[PDB]
Chain A
Amino acid sequence: DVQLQESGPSLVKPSQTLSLTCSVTGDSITSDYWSWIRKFPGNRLEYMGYVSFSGSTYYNPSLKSRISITRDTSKNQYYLDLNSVTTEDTATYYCANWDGDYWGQGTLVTVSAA
């Protein structure tokens, strides 16, 4: 069966690039659409975007083009890059298939001058 898991830093500095990796197991990345969803401290969900089988991408305008979602076939995993982060990007990040049946565990990423 299929299982997803997010990995990456929990603490990042303002203005830097936040990157997360989503590991997929049970099937090939090339066999589905993959997404990223984050939950803000206030119980507010935001669909960041997804990358389809043809490699085309769809990003949430709210991200003002600071986002990037790429795939790595050999490693059977995809990623999320978010540029010039601010404390406004502090949230719990989740990777999930487009259908919504497979979700990762979610991982808190805190943006702080510390």
Chain B
Amino acid sequence: DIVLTQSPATLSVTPGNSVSLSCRASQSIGNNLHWYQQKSHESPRLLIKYASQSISGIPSRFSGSGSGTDFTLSINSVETEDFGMYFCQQSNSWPYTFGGGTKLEIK
């Protein structure tokens, strides 16, 4: 099983500031890493697919980068609507696995 590790586990930021969230895989997965957001009492929402491909309907301030085993999700100028949990997921190999997640909250 491929293991995805996300660090930091928690991140506090002031709206208007930018942040970058990390996700590393125990082995190479090419570009097969996706990013999800999840608010309390809500279902996960796909933000970025295949490491860096954009998703229709998602704010442009979200962007992903990486390949191999090192990936990052970036939020240019954080907004109030962005506070919640962020998870990366690999689809390179079965079973699909998720990283532990990073919590983004107001400073």
Q: Do A and B have CB atoms closer than 8 angstroms in the complex?
A: yes
Binds A, one of B64-72, B73-81, B90-98: B90-98
Say if the beta carbon of B24 comes within 8 Å of chain A. no
Kindly report which residue of chain A lies nearest to residue B49, judged by CB atoms.
Answer: A100
Q: Which residues of B contact A104 (CB under 8 A)?
A: 43
* Interface residue B45 (Cβ < 8 Å from any Cβ of A): yes
Q: How many residues of A contact B (CB 8 A)?
A: 21
Residue of B nearest to A59 (CB): B95
> In the docked arrangement, what's the CA distance between A44 and B87, Å?
10
A94 to B43, CA, bound (A): 7
Question: Which B residues have a C-beta under 8 Å from some C-beta of A?
Answer: 1, 34, 36, 42-46, 49, 55, 85, 87, 89, 94-98, 100-101
Residue A37 CB within 8 A of the other chain: yes
Is A26 in contact with chain B by the CB < 8 A criterion?
no
Of the candidates B34, B49, B85, B89, which one forms a contact with A43 in the assembled complex, judged by CB atoms under 8 Å apart? B85
Additional A-B contacts beyond A58-B94, A61-B1, A106-B42 (18; CB < 8 A): A37-B44, A43-B85, A43-B101, A44-B98, A45-B44, A47-B97, A47-B98, A49-B95, A58-B95, A59-B95, A62-B95, A94-B43, A96-B43, A96-B44, A101-B46, A103-B43, A103-B44, A106-B43
